[PDB]
C-alpha cells in the first residue's frame, strides 16, 4: 500500500527466475506472442511499387503519412515499455511478455520504415517522414498525449496501462481500418499483408493490457477510465476527419467516426466496464 498490495507490482525476489509458471493466463499470452514471431524480411514488397505509382497523388500522401505516424508512435510505445512497464511490473510472466513486445515494436518500426524506403526514394522526403514527431502537425496531438503518460509521475499503473491500450487500440484503429480499405480495393499486397500482421500484434498487445488490468487490485474508477477513452476517441476522430482526412482515400468520414466509437466500446467491455457510445461496427471488413 499503495504498491505493496499489488501482486503485479510488489517485490518479487524470483522475478528473474523463469520457473515455475504461476500465472498461466499471462504466460499463454506470452506463448501466443512468441509463436507468431515474424521479421520484416518475411513480407514480399516486390509488387507494391507498380500499385503505388498507379495511385492518385493524394492517396500516396495519405498512405505515406499513415506510415510515418505508425513508425513514430511505435517508438513512443517502445519508450514506455522500456522505461516503465517492463521495469515496474514484477511478475516474471508479464516481464517475458513485455520483453517480447519491445522486440516486436522494433520489428513493427522497421517494417514501416521499409515500406517508406520502398515507396519513397527521395531522401529529403524519407527524412521528413521519419522525423514525423517534429515535422508532422497531424501526429502532434497523438504523440504529445502518449508522451504525457510516460512523463506522468502521479498516475497509477492502472491508469497508464489504460492509456497505452488507448494508444495501441484506439490511436491505431483508424489507420488500420484505412489499410484494410485499401485491401478492399486490391491495392498493395505488401502493405496490406504487413498490415494484417501488425494489427493482429497490436490487438494482442491490447488484450494483454486488458489482462494486466483484471489482475489489478486497485483499479481506477469506471468514471476515470471513460474520461481517458473518450478523450482518446475524440483525438483519433479529429486525426481522421481533420488533420489527415480519410476522404483522401475514398472513405466516409462519418462512418469512420462511428467505427472509432465501436472500437472504444469493445475495449471498454474488455476492461470489465460498460459501453460508452453503444454503436455498431459500420465496416463489414473489420
Catalytic residues: 112
Residues 161-200 that bind Fe ion (CB under 5 A): 168
39 binds a copy of itself (CB under 8 A): yes
74 is in an annotated binding site: yes
Task: State in angstroms the smallest separation of the CB of 101 from a copy of itself.
Answer: 9
Extract the C-alpha cell encoding 3: 504498491
Among 86, 118, 258, 281, indicate the residue that binds a copy of itself (CB under 8 A).
86
Task: State in angstroms the smallest separation of the CB of 223 from a copy of itself.
Answer: 33
**Which residues, 6 or more positions from 204, have their beta carbon under 8 angstroms from its beta carbon?**
29, 32, 33, 36
Residue spans of alpha helices (H) in the chain: 24-35, 48-54, 57-80, 86-88, 92-119, 123-130, 132-135, 137-151, 157-165, 173-184, 189-214, 222-238, 253-270
Among 76, 166, 249, 276, indicate the residue that binds a copy of itself (CB under 8 A).
76
Size of the site for Fe ion (CB under 5 A): 3
Nearest to 119 by CA among 204, 167, 187: 187
- Region of 16-24, 45-53, 253-261, 278-286 interacting with a copy of itself (CB under 8 A): 16-24
Report the C-alpha gap between 133 and 138 in whole angstroms.
Answer: 9
Extract the C-alpha cell encoding 182: 485499401
* DSSP letter assigned to residue 38: -
Site for Mg ion, rule CB under 5 A: 14, 17, 92
Long-range contacts made by residues 181-184, C-beta under 8 angstroms, separation at least 24? 181/249, 181/250, 181/251, 181/285, 182/63, 182/249, 183/285, 184/285
In the complex with a copy of itself, the residue whose CB is nearer, 79 or 227, is 79
Residues 101-130 that bind a copy of itself (CB under 8 A): 102-103, 106-107, 109-110, 112-113, 116-117, 126-127, 130
In the complex with a copy of itself, the residue whose CB is nearer, 83 or 144, is 83
CA-CA-CA-CA torsion sign (105, 106, 108, 109): positive
Among 65, 95, 160, 257, indicate the residue that binds a copy of itself (CB under 8 A).
95
- C-alpha 61: how far from its chain's center? 21
Which partner from the list a copy of itself, Fe ion, Mg ion, none does 168 bind, CB cut-off 5 to 8 Å by kind?
Fe ion
Mask: binding to a copy of itself, 126-155, rule CB under 8 A, as x and -? xx--xx-x----------------------
Count of C-beta atoms within a 10 Å radius of residue 203: 15
Extract the C-alpha cell encoding 77: 510505445
Name the packing angle between helices 173-184 and 57-80 (round to 10°).
140
> In degrees, to the nearest 5, what angle opens at C-alpha 67 toward C-alphas 168 and 247?
95
35 binds a copy of itself (CB under 8 A): yes
**Which residues form the interface with a copy of itself (CB under 8 A)?**
16-20, 34-35, 37, 39, 71-72, 74-76, 78-79, 82-83, 86-87, 95-96, 99-100, 102-103, 106-107, 109-110, 112-113, 116-117, 126-127, 130-131, 133
**Which residues form the interface with Fe ion (CB under 5 A)?**
168, 202, 205
Q: Which residues are annotated as a binding site for Fe cation?
A: 74, 105, 108, 168, 202, 205
Amino acid at each position: 500500500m499503495g504498491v505493496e498490495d499489488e501482486p503485479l507490482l510488489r517485490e518479487n525476489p524470483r522475478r528473474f527466475v523463469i520457473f515455475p509458471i504461476e500465472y498461466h493466463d499471462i504466460w499463454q499470452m506470452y506463448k501466443k506472442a512468441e509463436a507468431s514471431f515474424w521479421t520484416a524480411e518475411a513480407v514480399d514488397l516486390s509488387k507494391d511499387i507498380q500499385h503505388w505509382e498507379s495511385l492518385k497523388p493524394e492517396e500516396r500522401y495519405f498512405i505515406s503519412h499513415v506510415l510515418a505516424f505508425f513508425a513514430a508512435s511505435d517508438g513512443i510505445v517502445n519508450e514506455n515499455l522500456v522505461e516503465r512497464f517492463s521495469q515496474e511490473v514484477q511478475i516474471t510472466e508479464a516481464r517475458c511478455f513485455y520483453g517480447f513486445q519491445i522486440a516486436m515494436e522494433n520489428i513493427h518500426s522497421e517494417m514501416y520504415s521499409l515500406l517508406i524506403d520502398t515507396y519513397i526514394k527521395d531522401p529529403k522526403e524519407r527524412e521528413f517522414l521519419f522525423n514525423a514527431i517534429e515535422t508532422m502537425p497531424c501526429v502532434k496531438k497523438k504523440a504529445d498525449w502518449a508522451l504525457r503518460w510516460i512523463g506522468d509521475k502521479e498516475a497509477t499503473y492502472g491508469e497508464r496501462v489504460v492509456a497505452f491500450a488507448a494508444v495501441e487500440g484506439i490511436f491505431f484503429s483508424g489507420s488500420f481500418a484505412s489499410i484494410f480499405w485499401l485491401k478492399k480495393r486490391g491495392l498493395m499486397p505488401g502493405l496490406t499483408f504487413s498490415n494484417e500482421l501488425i494489427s493482429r500484434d497490436e490487438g494482442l498487445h491490447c488484450d494483454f493490457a486488458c489482462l494486466m488490468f483484471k489482475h489489478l487490485v486497485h483499479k481506477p474508477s469506471e468514471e476515470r477510465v471513460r474520461e481517458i477513452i473518450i478523450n482518446a476517441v475524440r483525438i483519433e476522430q479529429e486525426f481522421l476527419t481533420e488533420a489527415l482526412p480519410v476522404k483522401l482515400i475514398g472513405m466516409n468520414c462519418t462512418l469512420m467516426k462511428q467505427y472509432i466509437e465501436f472500437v472504444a466500446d469493445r475495449l471498454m467491455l474488455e476492461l470489465g466496464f460498460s459501453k460508452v457510445f453503444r454503436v455498431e461496427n459500420p465496416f463489414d471488413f473489420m
